[PDB]
């Protein structure tokens, strides 16, 4: 085949114009003429949250509920003072 001698000129010429358009698209100097902080958003947000959690939630009923703490044999209960009885002796030492 090969381009037709009258299509290798409509691509000859129109490519020449596209090259000028893209040159014109180029911006002149000046073209755009316009006319620790970490603590900031970690601490300031925090105070607020705390204010909210210790003086609304905490205050209202059943808003922050927690699984009972774990108490094992032989460990003391701070609030009441009781000492959890030590468990029955493990007889085996077999590894």
């Amino acid at each position: 085949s090969g381009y037709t001698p009258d299509e290798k000129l409509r691509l000859q010429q129109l490519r020449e114009l596209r090259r000028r358009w893209l040159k014109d698209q180029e911006l002149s100097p000046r073209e755009p003429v316009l006319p620790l902080f970490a603590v900031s958003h970690v601490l300031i947000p925090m105070w607020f949250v705390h204010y909210y959690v210790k003086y609304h939630m905490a205050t209202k009923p059943y808003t922050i509920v927690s699984s009972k703490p774990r108490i094992f044999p032989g460990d003391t209960i701070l609030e009441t003072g009781e000492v959890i009885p030590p468990m029955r002796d493990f007889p085996d030492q077999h590894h």
Binding site: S1, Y3, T4, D6, E7, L9, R10, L11, Q12, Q13, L14, L17, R18, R20, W21, L22, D24, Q25, L27, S28, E31, P32, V33, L34
Partner: protein, 178 residues
């Protein structure tokens, strides 16, 4: 995408466009390179023979059995380039190819900056309106006697005239807007 589609396809362009699909669908099977370059110069052989068949009937009987051999020996995931239709980046950047007739509704403030840009844009818009007449007339004076009509459009053929129906092949949104 640029040139216009021919009405019917010749024998050649059908054969020579298999040599592409075929060899390119042989590089999905032959993931390596030395294996490929080997298994492919063997392909040309297949096309190289049966090159000088003068018996059209035969030729169109080798072609029709080639494209069925191929359809059943093609790779399901061919290696299609990243930016071509069916690819992985096809039309990805089109969300950034605004059509350029939109800078005409910009607020006089926006166009205030970017000053020389619009000074050159107003030149080109003068070019476009300055030739629509000579163009359409050309398009018409050269309407070949009514008959076969293809989508091919004429070149300029005279100095100063801008090769016609050009405002959208030139002034096309840039490919990668980025």
């Amino acid at each position: 995408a640029f040139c216009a589609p021919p009405a019917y396809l010749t024998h050649q362009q059908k054969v020579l466009r298999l040599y592409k699909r075929a060899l390119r669908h042989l590089e999905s099977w032959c993931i390596h390179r030395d294996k490929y370059r080997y298994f492919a110069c063997l392909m040309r052989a297949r096309f190289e023979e049966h090159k000088n068949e003068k018996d059209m009937m035969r030729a169109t009987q080798l072609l029709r059995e080639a494209e069925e051999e191929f359809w059943q020996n093609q790779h399901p995931q061919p290696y299609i380039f990243p930016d071509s239709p069916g690819g992985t980046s096809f039309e990805r950047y089109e969300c950034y190819k605004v059509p350029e007739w939109c800078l005409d509704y910009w607020h006089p403030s926006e166009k205030a900056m970017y000053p020389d840009y619009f000074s050159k844009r107003e030149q080109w818009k003068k070019l476009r309106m300055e030739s629509w007449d000579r163009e359409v007339k050309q398009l018409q004076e050269e309407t070949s006697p009514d008959g076969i009509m293809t989508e091919a459009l004429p070149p300029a053929r005279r100095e100063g005239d801008l090769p016609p129906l050009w405002w959208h092949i030139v002034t096309r949104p840039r490919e990668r807007p980025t």
